[PDB]
Design a protein around this ligand. Sequence first.
Ligand SMILES: [Zn+2]
Length: 323
Amino acid sequence: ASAWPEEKNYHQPAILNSSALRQIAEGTSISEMWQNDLQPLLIERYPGSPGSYAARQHIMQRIQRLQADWVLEIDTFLSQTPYGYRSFSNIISTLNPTAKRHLVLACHYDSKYFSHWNNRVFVGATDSAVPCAMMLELARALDKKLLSLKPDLSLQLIFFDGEEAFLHWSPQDSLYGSRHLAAKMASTPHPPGARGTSQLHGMDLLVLLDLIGAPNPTFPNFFPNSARWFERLQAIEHELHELGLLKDHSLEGRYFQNYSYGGVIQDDHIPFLRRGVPVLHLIPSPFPEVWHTMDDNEENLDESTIDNLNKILQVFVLEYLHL
Ligand SMILES: [Zn+2]
């Protein structure tokens, strides 16, 4: 009876030296992400809307043009909602589908529904168009390294639909895509042919990005079973900082501080966490001041902070995958 699902407990990163860190810092382009990955998502895209379709096509197209062997799946399903039955579509992008273990990066691509107000439309820039764009830029920037995966461990990206409540949060009105996908993965044998292990056992760690893009974010270390990985983000941030590879950044104003948060934050990680999946929740506390406001737009995003976080996340992923 293989103990492979326990490998994630002992998994260690292969740390990048200074030369490699400089390479990663130089290999990501915040202006290219801004134009090519982010702006096309700064549109109204609540579930079922034309914008949802447009956002999904954009995410799929940006991944499809890459050299690495990404396998795209659209996970479409029905759920009851305050507005009756509706359809939702999660986007899953996977390298090495049969690999037993995957490091998983995720965010939600839907935008919260709001009737237009005084000619303003809610586009959820930090929530979560930026996280979507960061995942797309990571796939682009690391494409040559990821192509080499073509340690039975690889990478998966999930863009959840329906994270937002159609009204205000309630247990039944929110997390449509993640409640559905967590249940589906929990009941899907993995690897193919397995007798008693599921796709959830294969999830080494779920790194969920949400509400990223405002100035001065502070991310708390939420969970003890992923605290050692939170510490790696702190170390990566510290070293990139010391090497002069971050912009408009100080250690007093660092993003990953030494502090926990014992309360529960409702987000897409919940259905996974409650089924035993380790989660590294990259959501700031407090939330951006523009949270769920028409001001959560492009103008209020902090470019250098997003650039810095792209560098930190890309190093984290390469170190985890030993690339
Ligand atoms: Zn939101």
